[model samples]
Target chain A: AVANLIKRIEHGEVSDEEIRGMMKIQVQKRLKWGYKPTHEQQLAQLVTFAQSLKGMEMAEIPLPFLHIMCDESEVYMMDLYCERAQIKDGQSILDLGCGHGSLTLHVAQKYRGCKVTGITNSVSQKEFIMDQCKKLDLSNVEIILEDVTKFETEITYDRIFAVALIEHMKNYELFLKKVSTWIAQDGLLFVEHHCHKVFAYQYEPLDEDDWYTEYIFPGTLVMSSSSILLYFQEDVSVVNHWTLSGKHPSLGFKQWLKRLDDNIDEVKEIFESFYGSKEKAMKFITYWRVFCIAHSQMYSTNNGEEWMLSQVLFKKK
Target chain B: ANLIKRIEHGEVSDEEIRGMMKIQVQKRLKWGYKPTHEQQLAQLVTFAQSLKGMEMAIPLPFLHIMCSTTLDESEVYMMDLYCERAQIKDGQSILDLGCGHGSLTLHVAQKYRGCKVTGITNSVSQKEFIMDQCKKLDLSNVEIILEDVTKFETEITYDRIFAVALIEHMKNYELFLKKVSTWIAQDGLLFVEHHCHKVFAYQYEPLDEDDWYTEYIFPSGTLVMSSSSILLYFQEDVSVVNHWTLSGKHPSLGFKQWLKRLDDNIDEVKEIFESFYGSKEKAMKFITYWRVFCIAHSQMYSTNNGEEWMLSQVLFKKK
Candidate 1:
């Protein structure tokens, strides 16, 4: 279906020029960043992608199904962390870089007496979280807009969960030390890191290169397992550190790639103003295709080694 | 010289004018009037009726109906006493223009049984109704005319002319005043109860297109916000000794009863309205629009002046 749509555009039936113009517009709009599109457009894109689901039966369906899977995965991860970390009722939980308040809202709901605080640096993310909280009536959840390194809290928490957020912190030692001040006497800190040991060492020795620093992850400097231990040695005693291996990372990245590829036609249509033109769209699409291939190869060949790491349980001494 | 002019001169296509007109109409229609429903009328009536038989919270005529007007049975008796004390002679002539439901006309006839009274209105039903009411009340000297107040002509001068809540409806205020001014005797009085805005005393920009006053109840209705200007207009011709204001916000106690009576007889009211507009829905919509607009207008007035206030009535006498 994707090939047919592309072929139709290639032929004289649909104008390539219009698509190119659309691609340029899309790119400029995306770059502006904070200009949230209308709800109608968002719904239209979602519905269109949902309608284009085929050929991924063995893995997962696309669009709506993909959204459902992501939500389920998030719930599963939260449950796993809660169970492993022994989080109890009435415990104060702090979620660092809690992206859409998904973790914060869920935790607050499960533990009614618990006070949960989600922190994010983006103004748009903060606004989105506040609005979502209001809609959901999750009054216990408070979202603050500030950097995690500079954040101060008067109340000590029973547990501090930083899920998929440590990668963005440049100063790992400073972040750990700051968290140490707020952690209760026997409080546990669960730090989930997206680290590649070889890549972390290589990037640390070399003066931070642009590919990882600028595009992939801004303000991010990953650390090897030993480096992480050294940073947290004073105040935190690592009880268990596990490396998430096997096929999940490879499977997840491949699924994301396939999802992107499967909706290429619709994606091109929706994003035509940004990537429709031969001069611009081609360059953008080709870059993403290459990037995804590299990412997939990294996860698959490295036995999920390049993409994953975790600290199961750590206690403040 | 301009694009529209050029288009009109046939230098450009007619499509341009059509497009412009379409856009203008769409924009204008977007700021349309609000409708005042039965619920709102009930609320206003309740507020109005609360003013009877009691001293007001504020000064007279500030937020309620005219000071002299009453919702109680004592109104006619009081008016007679006032007229008698003012040296009104027997067999005097009086004209009651826009005699709505003939309340004032009946009261005048009852007070001055010997006086010559002529009641006139544009509504045919009202003219007949008043005449019937006069017959039932055994008033012999009173007569009714089904004629437009603006076009009515009479050679005889009136000793007194009374218009209650009437002048605000006239499309041409100056012409109405000029006509009424000529028909009065030297010592005669022209008592007009008018709805005036509080801001007319000073210069201000006109309301926006979405303003309720302009779009709804009073299309083409211009408020005499400035009492000074109105007084100046009548200054040279008459003594104009007293000018009073009655706040519509404080209508007499029976005002609620009057509105309720109107609502109870709304089938007739709707019939009367639909004869002109052909749609009860449209009329209702317009009233709703007006009520919302009025609330907004009151808010804007208070906010702009930095004072929490509302205006109801202005009473002026042509001396």
Candidate 2:
């Protein structure tokens, strides 16, 4: 099919959008890094670069790095959300994998009266959120560092969000079942997942011997849009599901990279704290950089229909 | 002379970097309008990664989009063209008046055997960097020197003297040019690339002190030039053999390619920025600052005369 697209593109039979819509294939091929690190050509580039980086201080490096982990646009994502849900001012909210409370902070600030609870496994994130709350004087928000998959609440949430969350799971149905039990009868279950097709973007099963499987997002495999729908089939109904973005995460990764670049010094400190040596820390950045540049291209749009983002609103019976 | 030079000399703190970033943002906010969703997405790409297709091939836009100095493929094309036009063959010496990373210097030396290349910069770290890189590459034909161009002293006349983005910083461009002309071989050529002040400036204010571009990127006391200014400066001992406004050749699409390169490596660069800046917000602000810088230059390249930075290249031959 892609060969046809390429031929069609050559013959002036394809539009730019049509071409970009299928960029995932092109991107995936690139991320495969032209030749794997197995080859001397590829391995030599990495080693030479790693060598160059050793004499360099983080300040000497001019691109983005650790700041890639945070995205404030989650506020933008949540705002468009509450407006769509027409969320009441006092409704309760649950944010799964609420890393550093990007969306959680906004919900609290904008809704003011609503009770918001966020869960994450990173204690650092919990402390960061707690610190941000006090600074913002946002007292109604509660953040806990706990296993999101097993956390329980005595009270039901008015809106339960697994925003970009379910992919981490080994069991999609179990997650849905858990959210179903805790959401109010008419409460909306907002699920934003990185949509996967067999050998598709983000979820493609990298060979067990591949670089990505061991380093980036190692624990989870992926499912297609059809399978995602089926997971909730005989049980819960999706009120609506829509393609939220097209190659947009590409731009997001770009911004994230710059932010990381800008904060290179601080990241060096953090990574140094973790890895305990400048050499190890920089090596970690090298691994991360290969992932970032490779994936940034992958997530970008180059054709007509290679889509990645999926946002759904589901309801209880 | 300005913040950029100071930063290069290890003379500024993260506080100063933060201050410059905040000012850069304020200028952007005042520039004109709010961004569309697409543009905002561009902003979020501060941490992007991937340089796969950010080709290092030529005739593409060669905007110097990052801090200090570096070259894109377009610059490589220009450098190649400049050297070719100057007839700089093997057994000749090349001088990069202010090489930042020795990017062009290394490329030229590696490509042309017997062509010993020299990279001169004021930064200690950059000097060390070029040396380290030269060692790793095992390029015995290249040398990195620590010297400010304005006060640089050298007896040997270079067969090809190229100052990529360095000529603009001179408060005394005429004197600098006269001095530089003396440093080029009688048979050799001097190539200079600089900004078009009249076409690119947002203000006609005195630029010796508080100009934004000067403070953030160039030397503080730096002054910009026009075609006439550049011509008049080089008129003392040399004549313009050929001059071209290559800005038009730098298309919007080419800038986008470079943007991809930066975005692809954003993760590493931004992490490095954050490490030095000391906080996430400051780091983000710094990235946005650079983003606005690139975005503005890109628009400048696409507009008047098809060049965004409103820059040009000129070659001179001694009379």
Candidate 3:
């Protein structure tokens, strides 16, 4: 199946046009686009370990041993995103799909005058963000619990930031146009997402043998090319674009996998109650470990050229 | 001077040239229009062996509507489709932007003698050739103007405007479309036809410094391989009424036909380039370069049975 998929890719048989229409009909009725909220009960228990325990914990690779557990990498990435976005004082900033509120809280605390809003799909995530904001005594932060596709507001932001969120969106033409309406004429949109250098396609299962799509994420991920957004520039024109080496996320995934293994005993205990059986709990942990391994290997291919990350800055037209 | 000297004295093999061009195809845009007006005319008119089948008509030709035999008939067939799609009235004021050799303009004038057709181009030689062809055909309603489109302006408005294979060369679509909108009457409609990629748009620049041979034919910032839907972004002055996507195979077939014609007339084309460049070496370079151009474009358009580098036809009405 892998060989056949490779053959199809080489012959230019991979595109969303061949698979489905603009709006993807989810394979499983329970799963949504962004996070696997079905596993929130399990993941919420892991919060005692760390806040940035999920996707994309940004840190320089070849890590010092303590940096993995010290919460320094999340702060490092938070500052990096802030510096790149150029968040000024008294400005309004909105974070789309703010996972765990890592960057959202960092921005709220770092710039005390600026008002920051974080939108998340899960109630657990919103509660976690609110609890963190209260402990930090940050009244400037507001956490909203809603799916991005259904979320709307009359308020516009000076800087609208989306990190690793657009990958879940299928109809960029409609979604970006809707987002453009929420940006002030002088506002900027900063997006960071995983992408390939040349081709864009949806994660449709090739066959019944494909477990990554069947068991894990099905029809929810759209692997975009670095230049896909350039075609959908109806309301926004690009000002700057950059590509990050795949090794960053590759190493980041390796760190998470290592952490999972290091705390395997506690993770299994947490999952045991969620599954109500040790066999099921062990299978789920193995699923997660394999998931991390698969992405780490996929992204590290071709010295990071095959699959990398794209950061784009767009200005309202 | 160094690069020019290297190109002059270059002794690269055919395999090397093919390899370099294949890399160019992967690293840059799929196609490129020639840069300056003079260079464009030189390639399309002076350096070409013949214009018998150089249709320059972008859309898919309706084969059944016409008694098509040779490639020349197919050119006429395509021109007839353009006329049908544009809905050209018998006595309406018409304008053709970037009218290469006045292929469509001449066809429209002869087909509808009551219509007043204006052809605009930046090439003097093209104007001369078109005017000569008009005289040979004895057409009085056709007029040819020589002016750069980016710098050109006119107070007169047209009832119908046609832009074929033109937008890819312009850098600013907003400015270009705004200018075209002003030249169109309030009730007028503009028809455009361009070859484009099915999905992604990109510039003809090299990907990086390692992509040295990418810009062999197309200089930097010379062209854009726009996506099929990219034109919908520039709807400030005009709104799109109709849109169509033609299979990539049409361009693939056209380029193959062009390659066959060029190969069949190699001796005449060699002489044409030799006289223009004043050197046999330069003539060989131009001939080989154009052969590579045709082959690469044909293969690119042939990808996925004409899915990758496709063609788009769009009609827009003034607001």
Candidate 4:
């Protein structure tokens, strides 16, 4: 049905009110948009790229942090993220939208004394995270299954990490306001998000030519302007900010596409069991292909200027 | 006004005359051996007509923080803020690197009677003025040393090191920090304040090839407007403890005040310049150079509501 929904919406005459309704529904479906495949299926098909999980954010060769680093692997990039964020030992940390627990487990293993909590919208993710924690004998890690936007806690953290998560969120003012409430008096928050150099916009298609949006990340994502978050500092103030070239994510997506193609037989089998047909399986395969290419092309354009990455350090007011 | 009158009427005391002669002697010796970039910087400062109206107490580009009635009051307020942010305490050995005019060095020494303050500067006149002020203020804990920071070697380590508005005048920051790292105690920290761009690092030069009217007052090859993240890359010997960015409006206001102060003392400043350059045309050129320096920097810092070119304060601990 998703394979043909693009064409139906492309040609079918729809009213403004109906489109607004669809937009609202898309926002409600943001969680499903992010973790569509079940945890078992994802673990079976994904993570073929050697120690990296779902989120393909944070690639290497970002300037100001380059020239002194080694192999451009996912684990090395993760280490750089931790270094830039100033993640220290014996602190309580939270990983927002902890997709498959890539960063959560890494920080947990590295900082043994730290109390690490990861929140996710999918129960399957929580189960998978606990399974990994048990296998690795990590008692410091805790997984919470809840919608991040609707979730609230009476507790706070010394360090809060939002990697590839804020892009899925709307209303930065309200979001950061809630996040600031979760920070200790002397705590810090580190955020990494993809951004356009000069423009902020929702990923909604304006026409049939924009099939990437109408099909893949319809309403769950946004391309924030590099300085847009500076406008929403009413509750939390920025301490440091850096802009990395877009080529990092571009190279990451290229790697993902290669890994997917290399393991296509196994990946197709996982999708076949989930979708129950060869036709539907191929449709999803094409979607994944389109998703990877679209991101790679957009990020690498204009020599990594048009689309880029922004890292911000924030403290509670 | 008294200083200006003395310069105008040639009422030079024998002791002051010796200090003036010392400048000439030191100039001839250093000009022979100093690098071309250092010589060019000396010329730039001299061409700006710095001797007359410039506040010898703390005459450099500085940050202004609180409400103050005069430029001197504003400077004291900003210096106090730096001392606080730099975590200065009494009885600690402090080193003021590139201690221009010893403004900060004098302030710290005067504020903390228990602390011993040492200031290093290549300018012979600066050292003389600082020591003279120390005598006038009855401070026995202040020491002024005349040495080039790049080549000066010492086994003496400090508890706290302050380098304010000096990094822009330097090149090869890696070597500079490495050398400084050796001068810091095991648990000591270094505080630095500098101006930078929000996202770009470039040589301090003219933006357009044809624009001779827009030349930078600071000489080329001696300065760089480093990006916000440039310092984060050079964490070999020392690591960053904290980082903060200041609004461009702070420095922009300071620059405007400097421009006003220079204009307020125009006749005296012009006369001092005329005597040095030996012509009315050359004196007017120096005045214009300083005016352009203030206005250009103010506008550049205040661009895009202080988000483009701004100020950075960093604290580093030996690694």
lDDT tens readout by residue for model 2, A50-82:
233323322102112212455447557778777
User: What is the per-residue lDDT of model 4 for residues B287-314, given as tens digits with 9 covering 90 to 100?
Assistant: 6656656666666666556655677777
Which residue pairs show backbone clashes in model 4? none
Candidate 3's TM-score? 0.59
Candidate 1 wrongly placed segments (more than 4 Å): A1-71, A197-199, A202-220, A262-292, A305-307, B1-319
- Per-residue C-alpha lDDT of model 4 across residues A1-317, encoded as one tens digit per residue: 34554434434343334443454344334323333233222222222211121133221111111111112467987897788778899999999998778789889999999999999877656766777788899998998888788778999999999999877765676778889899987899999888765546556655443345667764345557665565455567666666777788888887877877777786667667767897776767666665666677667665676577888788776
- Residues B21-96, candidate 1, lDDT per residue (tens digit)? 3443333323221132222223322322232222211111111122133345545554564354334566888888
**Residue B258 lDDT, candidate 2, scale 0-100:** 57
Between candidates 1 and 3, the DockQ winner: 3
Show where candidate 3 strays beyond 4 Å: A1-80, A83-86, A218-221, A273-280, B1-95, B108-118, B122-147, B154-178, B181-319
Question: In candidate 4, residue A246 scores what lDDT?
Answer: 72
> What is candidate 1's CAPRI-style docking category based on DockQ?
incorrect
For all predicted structures, in order, the TM-scores are 0.35, 0.39, 0.59, 0.49
Chain A, candidate 4, TM-score of 0.76
Q: What is the TM-score of chain B in candidate 1?
A: 0.57
- The residue-by-residue lDDT of candidate 2 on B191-228, one tens digit each, is 87766531212222333455455445433332333431
Report how closely model 2 matches the true complex, as a DockQ value: 0.01
Global lDDT of each candidate: 0.51, 0.57, 0.67, 0.67
TM-score for the A-chain in each candidate structure:
0.63, 0.72, 0.74, 0.76
In candidate 3, how many clashes are counted? 0
For model 3, how does the per-residue alpha-carbon lDDT over B130-240 read when each residue is reduced to its tens digit?
A: 787789999999999999877888999999999998976765566777889999986898998888875556556677766644467575654656666556555656766
